[PDB]
Structures are given as structure tokens and as C-alpha cells.
Design an enzyme around this catalytic site. Structure first.
Site, PDB file in Angstrom:
ATOM      1  N   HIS A  75       0.820  -1.225   0.000  1.00 10.98           N
ATOM      2  CA  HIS A  75       0.000   0.000   0.000  1.00 10.98           C
ATOM      3  C   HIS A  75       0.855   1.277   0.000  1.00 10.98           C
ATOM      4  O   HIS A  75       0.947   2.019   0.993  1.00 10.98           O
ATOM      5  CB  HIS A  75      -1.038  -0.047   1.129  1.00 10.98           C
ATOM      6  N   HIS A 115      -7.350   6.686  -3.576  1.00 14.07           N
ATOM      7  CA  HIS A 115      -7.979   5.558  -2.876  1.00 14.07           C
ATOM      8  C   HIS A 115      -7.299   4.936  -1.661  1.00 14.07           C
ATOM      9  O   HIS A 115      -8.006   4.333  -0.856  1.00 14.07           O
ATOM     10  CB  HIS A 115      -8.479   4.490  -3.859  1.00 14.07           C
ATOM     11  N   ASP A 116      -5.956   5.035  -1.536  1.00 16.58           N
ATOM     12  CA  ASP A 116      -5.195   4.430  -0.431  1.00 16.58           C
ATOM     13  C   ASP A 116      -4.287   5.411   0.319  1.00 16.58           C
ATOM     14  O   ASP A 116      -3.296   4.990   0.927  1.00 16.58           O
ATOM     15  CB  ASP A 116      -4.356   3.245  -0.946  1.00 16.58           C
ATOM     16  N   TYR A 247       0.918  -8.472   5.224  1.00 12.32           N
ATOM     17  CA  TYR A 247       0.037  -9.377   5.946  1.00 12.32           C
ATOM     18  C   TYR A 247       0.786 -10.090   7.081  1.00 12.32           C
ATOM     19  O   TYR A 247       0.240 -10.208   8.176  1.00 12.32           O
ATOM     20  CB  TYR A 247      -0.570 -10.398   4.967  1.00 12.32           C
TER      21      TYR A 247
HETATM   22  C1  7RG Z   1      -2.335 -12.901  -0.967  1.00 15.81           C
HETATM   23  C2  7RG Z   1      -3.740 -12.360  -0.708  1.00 15.81           C
HETATM   24  C3  7RG Z   1      -4.476 -13.200   0.356  1.00 15.81           C
HETATM   25  N1  7RG Z   1      -5.881 -12.881   0.065  1.00 15.81           N
HETATM   26  C4  7RG Z   1      -6.691 -13.966   0.622  1.00 15.81           C
HETATM   27  C5  7RG Z   1      -8.055 -13.446   0.980  1.00 15.81           C
HETATM   28  N2  7RG Z   1      -9.093 -14.265   0.850  1.00 15.81           N
HETATM   29  C6  7RG Z   1     -10.322 -13.868   1.180  1.00 15.81           C
HETATM   30  C7  7RG Z   1     -10.513 -12.566   1.655  1.00 15.81           C
HETATM   31  C8  7RG Z   1      -9.394 -11.733   1.767  1.00 15.81           C
HETATM   32  N3  7RG Z   1      -8.196 -12.196   1.414  1.00 15.81           N
HETATM   33  C9  7RG Z   1      -6.046 -12.912  -1.396  1.00 15.81           C
HETATM   34  C10 7RG Z   1      -4.662 -12.531  -1.954  1.00 15.81           C
HETATM   35  C11 7RG Z   1      -4.693 -11.287  -2.816  1.00 15.81           C
HETATM   36  N4  7RG Z   1      -5.153 -10.167  -2.326  1.00 15.81           N
HETATM   37  C12 7RG Z   1      -5.161  -9.023  -3.052  1.00 15.81           C
HETATM   38  C13 7RG Z   1      -4.654  -9.019  -4.368  1.00 15.81           C
HETATM   39  C14 7RG Z   1      -4.765  -7.701  -4.845  1.00 15.81           C
HETATM   40  N5  7RG Z   1      -5.260  -6.957  -3.899  1.00 15.81           N
HETATM   41  N6  7RG Z   1      -5.547  -7.750  -2.781  1.00 15.81           N
HETATM   42  C15 7RG Z   1      -6.049  -7.308  -1.485  1.00 15.81           C
HETATM   43  C16 7RG Z   1      -7.581  -7.193  -1.446  1.00 15.81           C
HETATM   44  C17 7RG Z   1      -7.979  -6.693  -0.041  1.00 15.81           C
HETATM   45  O1  7RG Z   1      -7.337  -5.432   0.225  1.00 15.81           O
HETATM   46  C18 7RG Z   1      -5.915  -5.588   0.354  1.00 15.81           C
HETATM   47  C19 7RG Z   1      -5.306  -6.057  -0.976  1.00 15.81           C
HETATM   48  C20 7RG Z   1      -4.150 -10.288  -4.912  1.00 15.81           C
HETATM   49  O2  7RG Z   1      -3.691 -10.376  -6.040  1.00 15.81           O
HETATM   50  N7  7RG Z   1      -4.200 -11.370  -4.088  1.00 15.81           N
HETATM   51 MG    MG Z   2      -7.691   0.137  -0.019  1.00 14.69          MG
HETATM   52 ZN    ZN Z   3      -5.750  -0.271  -3.026  1.00 14.10          ZN
END
Ligand code: 7RG
Ligand code: MG
Ligand code: ZN
Length: 328
Positions: A75, A115-116, A247
Site C-alpha cells: 500500500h 484511494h489508499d 500481511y
Molecule cells: C495474498 C492475498 C491473500 N488474500 C486472501 C483473501 N481471501 C479472502 C478474503 C481476503 N483475502 C487474497 C490474496 C490477494 N489479495 C489481493 C490481491 C490484490 N489486492 N488484494 C487485497 C484485497 C484486499 O485489500 C488488500 C489487498 C491479490 O492479487 N491477491
Molecule cells: Mg484500499
Molecule cells: Zn488499493
């Protein structure tokens, strides 16, 4: 391909051209080159012309936006650039200037850039569970998105950054309302709700219906925000590791503070491949499938890279799972 060398901030004709496509390598550029790219987009889309944006103010505004992004693994300013560049690519691909007014394009572009703003690198679930100042301020209602919004309007309130200074008050209020709707729509906790509302309008879509257009603009900003996997594999792949880095920082802190940890943030539960297969199959592909009904050109340009990505992560998963099994 020029008679002399020009500094990096002077975009080459090749860069200008490549900037219009989702194949653009977002990694090759320094912040100043990305700032020049964003500036070009405002001039090229006729936004500087139609909204009498002072060209210097546009630059100061973009520089201030850049400064208000944090040095997070995901971000950050390069992410802000991705979302805006994907939006700009979608304007050309989907011929959005035929369907949307200049005010709508302005809202789409400004919301994509903003947005961020000032994202701390810890999601809304962290904010809420940790009862942070942001969660307390926003009453657990999309705290981050509300903050990104507030920061956007705080920057625009500085006279040297006010790109909307020559827009009449009624126009400003219209842009402000649209930008708030779009930035707030980026909260993934609302994904299913927004997808359901859009699909309901998609039963008999109307380009002259304001409600339909608001939902389409929300879907467009959502598409751009989570669009990394649409990009070529070499460009898309490093972003997953960046997000996982953020994360893992959060889950480590949550463990330390005695707060709930999400399985997709647990180092021992989540794998890049399994996380991406699910996200591509159940979030990305279905979302781009609904857009394809309105814009048939989105299948070849955006669904095809998503199918290729899903198939490559399935291959990676077979090897990764077998490798991880030897590790025990
Ligand atoms: C490796 C990430 C783990 N996540 C698992 C998950 N499952 C269910 C609900 C939430 N996450 C999905 C993966 C992921 N998240 C993304 C991506 C892009 N934005 N976000 C995110 C979208 C949310 O905002 C932050 C960036 C992407 O390409 N992959
Ligand atoms: Mg956002
Ligand atoms: Zn974003």
C-alpha cells in the site's frame, strides 16, 4: 530512438504509447517518472482542458499525493500508480469517453489516485480488533477508506494543490460525492454486496441511469484496485510477495498483542499459489466476467491473463505443496 538523451521525467514517445495498455511494466519507474505518467494522463484525457486545471497545481497536487503515501511493501505510491494506470488503460480499452462524461472520468481517475492515501500497512480488521484511533474515529465503519478519503480532501483544501479551484461549486460537490462513493467502495468487506447490486442492474443495464452508472464506476475502481493479476506474469507476481510481507507484519503483531489472526495471514497456513488460485477463480474472474457483458474487449485483454495466471499458480501449487511436505 531520439537524436539526444532526455532526462527520465521527460517521458519518451514509447512510454506515452505503452502507458495506455495493461502490459505497462510498473516496476521500471522511479517516483518522478510515475508522477510524470500521472500528469500526462490528466492532460491526455482532456481533464486539464475541461476542468481548467492549472498545469503547475496538477504537479504540486501529484507531488503532495506522493508524499502522503507511506513506504509500505504493498500500500504505497507504486500501488496508487497501478490502480490509476489500469483505470487509464480501461478508459482506452472500454472506450469510456463515449459512455461517461468528463466529470465521471475525473472522478474515476482522482479516486484511483487517492484511494489508499496514508495507508498504515494494517487492514480494517486490525484497526477494529486493536481499537485504534482510526477505528474509534470512524466507529468501525470502513476506517481506512474513510481516512484515505479525508486525506484526499485535506490535500485538495491546500490552495497550491487544489486541482478543482476553477470548477464551479456545484461541479465540486458532484466530484466530491462521486470520489467519496468510489474510495469507500474499495473496502473488500463490501465486495459481495456491490457485486450483487451491479449484477441486479446488469439484468437490464441503462447508461442513462445514474444509479447504474454509480455501480459501474464502483465496479471499475474495484477492478483497477485488485487488478495486479491482469498484468503480465513478470509484472504481477512480485505484488503478491509485497502484500504477503504486509500481511505477515500484521499477523506477527496480532500474535504479539493477543488479537485474532486471519488464516490467509498465517505464515504456516497461507501459500502464495493457493491464495492466488482462490482469489483469481472466485474474486477476479467473476468480477471481470460481469464487466465483459458490457465491454466484450475485456475478455481477450483481461480475462485471458487471469486464466493463464490461474493455470500457472495451479502448476506452482503442485510443486510448492510437494516441496513443503519434505520440509516436515
Ligand atoms: C495474498 C492475498 C491473500 N488474500 C486472501 C483473501 N481471501 C479472502 C478474503 C481476503 N483475502 C487474497 C490474496 C490477494 N489479495 C489481493 C490481491 C490484490 N489486492 N488484494 C487485497 C484485497 C484486499 O485489500 C488488500 C489487498 C491479490 O492479487 N491477491
Ligand atoms: Mg484500499
Ligand atoms: Zn488499493
Amino acid at each position: 530512438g531520439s537524436h539526444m538523451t532526455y532526462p527520465k521525467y521527460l517521458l519518451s514517445p514509447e512510454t506515452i504509447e505503452a502507458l495506455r495498455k495493461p502490459t505497462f511494466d510498473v516496476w521500471l519507474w522511479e517516483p518522478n517518472e510515475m508522477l510524470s505518467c500521472l500528469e500526462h494522463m490528466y492532460h491526455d484525457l482532456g481533464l486539464v482542458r475541461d476542468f481548467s486545471i492549472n498545469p503547475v497545481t496538477l504537479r504540486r497536487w501529484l507531488f503532495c499525493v506522493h508524499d502522503n503515501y507511506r513506504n509500505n511493501p504493498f500500500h504505497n505510491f507504486r500501488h496508487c500508480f497501478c490502480v490509476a494506470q489500469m483505470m487509464y488503460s480501461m478508459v482506452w480499452l472500454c472506450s469510456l469517453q463515449e459512455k461517461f462524461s468528463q466529470t465521471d472520468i475525473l472522478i474515476l481517475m482522482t479516486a484511483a489516485i487517492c484511494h489508499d492515501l496514508d495507508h498504515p500497512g494494517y487492514n480494517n480488521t486490525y484497526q477494529i480488533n486493536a481499537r485504534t484511533e482510526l477505528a474509534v474515529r470512524y466507529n468501525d465503519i470502513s476506517p481506512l477508506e474513510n481516512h484515505h478519503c479525508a486525506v484526499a480532501f485535506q490535500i485538495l483544501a491546500e490552495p497550491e494543490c487544489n486541482i478543482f479551484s476553477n470548477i464551479p461549486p456545484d461541479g465540486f460537490k458532484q466530484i466530491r460525492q462521486g470520489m467519496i462513493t468510489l474510495i469507500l467502495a474499495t473496502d473488500m468487506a463490501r465486495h459481495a454486496e456491490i457485486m450483487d447490486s451491479f449484477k441486479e442492474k446488469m439484468e437490464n443495464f441503462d447508461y442513462s441511469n445514474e444509479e447504474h452508472m454509480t455501480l459501474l464506476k464502483m465496479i471499475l475502481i474495484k477492478c483497477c484496485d485488485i487488478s495486479n493479476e491482469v498484468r503480465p506474469m513478470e509484472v504481477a507476481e512480485p505484488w503478491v510477495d509485497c502484500l504477503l510481507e504486509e500481511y505477515f507484519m500484521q499477523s506477527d503483531r496480532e500474535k504479539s498483542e493477543g488479537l485474532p489472526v486471519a488464516p490467509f495471514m498465517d505464515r504456516d497456513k497461507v501459500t502464495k499459489a493457493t491464495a492466488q488460485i482462490g482469489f483469481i477463480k472466485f474474486v477476479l474472474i467473476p468480477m471481470f466476467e460481469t464487466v465483459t457483458k458490457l465491454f466484450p474487449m475485456v475478455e481477450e485483454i483481461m480475462l485471458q491473463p487471469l486464466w493463464e495466471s490461474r493455470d500457472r499458480y495451479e502448476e506452482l501449487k503442485r510443486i510448492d505443496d510437494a516441496m513443503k511436505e519434505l520440509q516436515k
